[PDB]
Ligand binder design. Sequence first.
Ligand SMILES: *[C@@H]1O[C@H](CO[C@@H]2O[C@@H](C)[C@@H](O)[C@@H](O)[C@@H]2O)[C@@H](O[C@@H]2O[C@H](CO)[C@@H](O[C@@H]3O[C@H](CO[C@H]4O[C@H](CO)[C@@H](O)[C@H](O)[C@@H]4O[C@@H]4O[C@H](CO)[C@@H](O)[C@H](O)[C@H]4NC(C)=O)[C@@H](O)[C@H](O[C@H]4O[C@H](CO)[C@@H](O)[C@H](O)[C@@H]4O[C@@H]4O[C@H](CO)[C@@H](O)[C@H](O)[C@H]4NC(C)=O)[C@@H]3O)[C@H](O)[C@H]2NC(C)=O)[C@H](O)[C@H]1NC(C)=O
Ligand SMILES: *[C@@H]1O[C@H](CO[C@@H]2O[C@@H](C)[C@@H](O)[C@@H](O)[C@@H]2O)[C@@H](O[C@@H]2O[C@H](CO)[C@@H](O[C@@H]3O[C@H](CO[C@H]4O[C@H](CO)[C@@H](O)[C@H](O)[C@@H]4O[C@@H]4O[C@H](CO)[C@@H](O)[C@H](O)[C@H]4NC(C)=O)[C@@H](O)[C@H](O[C@H]4O[C@H](CO)[C@@H](O)[C@H](O)[C@@H]4O[C@@H]4O[C@H](CO)[C@@H](O)[C@H](O)[C@H]4NC(C)=O)[C@@H]3O)[C@H](O)[C@H]2NC(C)=O)[C@H](O)[C@H]1NC(C)=O
Lengths: 207, 207, 13, 13
Amino acid sequence: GPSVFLFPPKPKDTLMISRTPEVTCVVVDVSHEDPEVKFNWYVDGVEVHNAKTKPREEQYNSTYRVVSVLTVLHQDWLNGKEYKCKVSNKALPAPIEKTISKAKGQPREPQVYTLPPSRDELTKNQVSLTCLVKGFYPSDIAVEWESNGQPENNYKTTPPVLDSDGSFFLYSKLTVDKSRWQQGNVFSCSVMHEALHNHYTQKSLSL
Amino acid sequence: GPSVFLFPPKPKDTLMISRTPEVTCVVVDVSHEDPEVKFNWYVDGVEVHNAKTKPREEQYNSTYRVVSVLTVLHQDWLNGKEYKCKVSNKALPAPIEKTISKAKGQPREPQVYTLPPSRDELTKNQVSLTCLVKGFYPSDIAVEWESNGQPENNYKTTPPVLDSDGSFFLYSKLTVDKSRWQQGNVFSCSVMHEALHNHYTQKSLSL
Amino acid sequence: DCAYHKGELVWCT
Amino acid sequence: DCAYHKGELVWCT
Ligand SMILES: *[C@@H]1O[C@H](CO[C@@H]2O[C@@H](C)[C@@H](O)[C@@H](O)[C@@H]2O)[C@@H](O[C@@H]2O[C@H](CO)[C@@H](O[C@@H]3O[C@H](CO[C@H]4O[C@H](CO)[C@@H](O)[C@H](O)[C@@H]4O[C@@H]4O[C@H](CO)[C@@H](O)[C@H](O)[C@H]4NC(C)=O)[C@@H](O)[C@H](O[C@H]4O[C@H](CO)[C@@H](O)[C@H](O)[C@@H]4O[C@@H]4O[C@H](CO)[C@@H](O)[C@H](O)[C@H]4NC(C)=O)[C@@H]3O)[C@H](O)[C@H]2NC(C)=O)[C@H](O)[C@H]1NC(C)=O
Ligand SMILES: *[C@@H]1O[C@H](CO[C@@H]2O[C@@H](C)[C@@H](O)[C@@H](O)[C@@H]2O)[C@@H](O[C@@H]2O[C@H](CO)[C@@H](O[C@@H]3O[C@H](CO[C@H]4O[C@H](CO)[C@@H](O)[C@H](O)[C@@H]4O[C@@H]4O[C@H](CO)[C@@H](O)[C@H](O)[C@H]4NC(C)=O)[C@@H](O)[C@H](O[C@H]4O[C@H](CO)[C@@H](O)[C@H](O)[C@@H]4O[C@@H]4O[C@H](CO)[C@@H](O)[C@H](O)[C@H]4NC(C)=O)[C@@H]3O)[C@H](O)[C@H]2NC(C)=O)[C@H](O)[C@H]1NC(C)=O
């Protein structure tokens, strides 16, 4: 019948004390004749009850989608607590238990390197500012780019790539017209991640 | 009942004359009561019969996996001919078909760029050599690392990611010993693409 | 000492 | 003249 999906919260939300991380338990394919869903929650066997249900929706393919969102404590998630969501629906011979939680593995620092644009690119019209973000763990990470207080617009970040030592890397290349680059502007790479100090560092680039 | 997948040539098998590219038609979940599977190949609507069938191997999940494979031509894969398999089986109301062309889009050639390891990374036991490959279409590509005629090993290459003005790009990190690097050995990033002159270019990197 | 991200407090220690 | 990778003919022009 229904099929459920448990989701982590954004790695910006777990790493920023400003933000507020949420586990999201999505029950899709919910029947039309029998749309009642019960969510028990468990934070390590411990049943907890501060979770809200988000508004019922139809979807248009004759099935409801029902979602229960659960607040989490940054501290809790970042340590490794198993979150369990147990869904039950009359259209189901037995409750479905789905259980998430970040990568088991000792956290490891991201070493962060700003690589400039190749000599062979003064030629080109727009150029390539590069950010190597290697040696980190888990892969849950947030990488953005900025200049003089402002977010730099058009960049692109590769997916984390498993490396031969168990750790992870990714690249981010900002594209910016020679003109800019050439004019002494400072562009910076802002990485934020668990094993980082205050979950945040920034490395920059110029001339 | 049965189910079927169609697969392109290996990038490199299609971009070098030395090698001979193949398209591969896999028919998983073949019965064993009615294991007999018959094919028809078409190249742009034109049926072709010079095409071998691979040994029929048993999967151990109560099904057969029978594969047909059809030699193609470097010349006319890169050009755009549309290869089409065509499975029919007794366990199957109508013949199934899928058609594997390449990537409809102008070929655009890749720029290669060798970005030395960051100043801040000479402390570490090992340093990262970077290959920025930017601005190619289609994303079908091969990338490797060599040094003094020899195939440098522990490297790792991000997947192609779509890049904003239609094009594609990846990175590739080579990991060498800080020692080797400072000796001044040259390490080359080798790149094969349909939109390259002679499908090949090679860029260099060293102290 | 604190980190901020585009001015939005990240973490303190 | 022709392109070689690892000494294996790629493509000639
Ligand atoms: C009726 O309609 C609804 C909705 O309709 C939808 O939209 C319409 C207009 C049509 O075009 C439809 O084609 C379309 O589906 C249908 O509901 C869909 O149902 C399918 C399954 O039946 C679900 O598939 C799952 O997808 C998850 C990932 O889900 C995200 O990404 C989607 C886009 O990629 C996005 O739309 C979703 O919103 C969701 O987005 C994430 O949501 C979180 C939470 O809010 C958010 O924070 C994120 O930012 C957001 N990300 C975005 C937006 O990009 C996928 O992971 C599942 O795959 C796993 O499941 C497979 C089997 O289901 C399994 O075989 C795989 O191996 C894989 O398994 C897991 O892998 C991980 C790690 O590898 C691990 O957990 C396990 O190893 C393994 N777990 C297992 C196997 O249990 C899955 O495919 C759709 O998400 C869902 N759509 C929506 C919008 O909810 C419904 O089916 C229709 N009914 C019918 C047709 O009868
Ligand atoms: C009975 O067993 C068989 C055999 O399996 C095996 O059985 C036992 C012994 C166990 O050991 C198994 O684990 C073992 O594998 C079962 O057959 C499996 O069936 C599934 C689905 O039914 C197939 O999945 C498909 O897989 C392809 C990719 O598969 C390649 O890679 C495999 C490893 O990843 C490799 O083992 C495969 O053989 C195959 O390898 C390629 O083969 C060619 C030639 O041989 C070679 O040149 C390549 O190098 C090689 N690649 C390698 C080795 O990496 C997957 O891509 C398919 O995905 C499409 O379709 C899905 C829907 O069916 C969809 O969900 C996917 O997202 C994907 O969708 C497509 O996505 C692309 C973009 O990504 C998009 O452009 C398309 O439009 C889109 N198409 C859609 C959506 O339709 C597909 O999932 C397995 O291949 C197959 N296993 C084997 C070995 O063949 C069988 O199911 C069992 N029956 C049961 C249990 O009842």
